[PDB]
Amino acid sequence: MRLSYEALEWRTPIENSTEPVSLPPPPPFFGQERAREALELAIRGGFHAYLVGPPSLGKHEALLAYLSTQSVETPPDLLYVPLSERKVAVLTLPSGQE
């Protein structure tokens, strides 16, 4: 059958090409409910996750933006203690005790 122009037009109509718009920033992983839920679970449980996506999806940047909003207890001041002149170990202390 011959396709009419009406059934072929796809461009969303433009009612004004001026008046610059001001829109609120979207939450990280917008339209990516699967990845955002997986990362919510990984953060909640402390599991090691891994992000998968075709390249140029900005996985590295949204992930950092999403993690920056997170809240965690103050990380302990880990420090190397010499158990001898030959052996050293990594020791974690509460913040400010180092």
Place this chain on the structure above:
Amino acid sequence: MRLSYEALEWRTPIENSTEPVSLPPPPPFFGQERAREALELAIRGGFHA
């Protein structure tokens, strides 16, 4: 069909050869409009071309 000699000539005829030609230097990327415009865009935007 046989091709006549007039249909096989391609060399531009020479009218004079004793006078040394004098011409101004061509702009960079002459004939290369696409490359020149691509570099213009890269320089204007600071992209990596």
Place this chain on the structure above:
Amino acid sequence: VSLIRPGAVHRAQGGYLILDALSLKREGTWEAFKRALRNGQVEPVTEPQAPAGLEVEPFPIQMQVILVGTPEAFEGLEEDPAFSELFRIRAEFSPTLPASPENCTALGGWLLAQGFQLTQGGLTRLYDEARRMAEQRDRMDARLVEIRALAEEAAVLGGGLLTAESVEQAIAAREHRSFLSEEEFLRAVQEGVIRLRTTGRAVGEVNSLVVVEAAPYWGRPARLTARAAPGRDHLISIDREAGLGGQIFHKAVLTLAGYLRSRYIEHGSLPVTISLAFEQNYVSIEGDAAGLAELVAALSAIGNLPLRQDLAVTGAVDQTGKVLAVGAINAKVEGFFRVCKALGLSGTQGVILPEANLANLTLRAEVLEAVRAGQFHIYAVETAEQALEILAGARMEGFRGLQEKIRAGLEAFARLEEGHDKEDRE
């Protein structure tokens, strides 16, 4: 102990260590990393000519590791069962987002946060181009950096403000910067080096549409010729026999052979040998998008049907005759439109594309304007029979029909085989 430099693992404690799977796989440090995660062994590396070292006590790990990588980068990494055991949570990004006002607003907000100042026209054009990149009409490309790069080019070319004209200029320049191959092909076609007929009718010739497998995927018609000769049942794909056809192309040719063999049952084996050749090809054809084109070409060769050269036929076909969807339909249709425009639009050129690609048609402004004026047509077919009716300008049913003409052609070829074999016997 005072000379131990902390690494990424040491400053990731109590937090998250973001890594690229490419670097872990490429640098041979995947084994050491999984050993640090499983056994809690983090030893500061030392140059190979070291006098001695420090026997670092095993170090419990309190971090979360979030690998980031392409699916191809991880497919080289699930081969180790330790990867499945350690990284249990799989966060996967959909290549496309649904096309909706909510996602348009989200894209606008994201681009505004990125620093661009969007007019409504510019945002709408960027969202439409995202849908075009996704190749869908109801889905938009989820590759936000690609859209950000296009937005940056639009800002540069428009003066910093993203208007519809600026985004159109950016897209036009993006097409024009990689247009050299298409310019060369169009010049060759105009000069006559690559002979493509976009007007008139010819028998056994179909302007099959192919996609160049390099650069921006430019579509371009490649004339296909089918020759029906009496002989043993054999569908000869010249490109496949010469080695220019891939696995999928060979599967498509075999599927066409099966459809032809099973469709016409009035003799024994199919009484014709069909030679399908992509003229002027000289390259490897490893896709299945010409199945319908070469099928209608074979049918025309069998039946001596004069096929219209205005219409370019694309789309795969199964062995029951039904046209299946193909990808990159936008590229094929726009390439054929470019080739028609170079030779001049006669007001009857068109493209025959599968009915399943109604949702994959995101044609440019020029193609849609040509369709509006009637200078370019788009035909949607569900079965190969409809494609043949549209090409030959007749109907299979009824007398003087295409089906009866194909039957008559097959009967003539079978009679020629009969005559030769009887002459052999007598």
Place this chain on the structure above:
Amino acid sequence: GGQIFHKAVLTLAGYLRSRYIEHGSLPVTISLAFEQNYVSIEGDAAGLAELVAALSAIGNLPLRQDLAVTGAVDQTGKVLAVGAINAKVEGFFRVCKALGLSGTQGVILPEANLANLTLRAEVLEAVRAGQFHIYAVETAEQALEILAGARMEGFRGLQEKIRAGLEAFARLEEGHDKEDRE
């Protein structure tokens, strides 16, 4: 032989099978050989040459050795453009000059290569003097007509002679089968 050469040979076979359907199949086995070759050839620029050679072999048509033939041919029998046309034409001119110009040697090249004909000087003065000819063809039928020096249509034409040769080969195959069966 490269993949393109095999494609050209298959295209030639398809053209021969489709054009001559007077019998249930092409009743001739044609062997095409580039003699004194000893090196792989990968292009399809010889499609028209081997097509006219095979047609002459079928029809017992004596082709002129004065004219060289270049250019690919599709299944429709339309001569296709080929690259390095200047190199081929000048090479044949050098060979003709070394063996002495007889005033009739020439080259048959596709009509689509007229834009690509940028020949050396000596070839051009040879053409001026009438010592070298360049024939542009767009159909293998025209190339065969020029080589064999006869019109394809009509009585005592090349087409009828090709059909007669094919008929003779078919009748001898028929005689073989009939004798063997009986």
Place this chain on the structure above:
Amino acid sequence: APAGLEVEPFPIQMQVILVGTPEAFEGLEEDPAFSELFRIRAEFSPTLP
């Protein structure tokens, strides 16, 4: 060296303009990061009108 220098890196303000034959980039365009980094393509037409 026994004790190296932990040189902290510096911001980049340069623009990179690679030059190469089409097949020199054919082995380099298959890297997905190349497309994202180098956006502007400057094509040189091998023949001029």
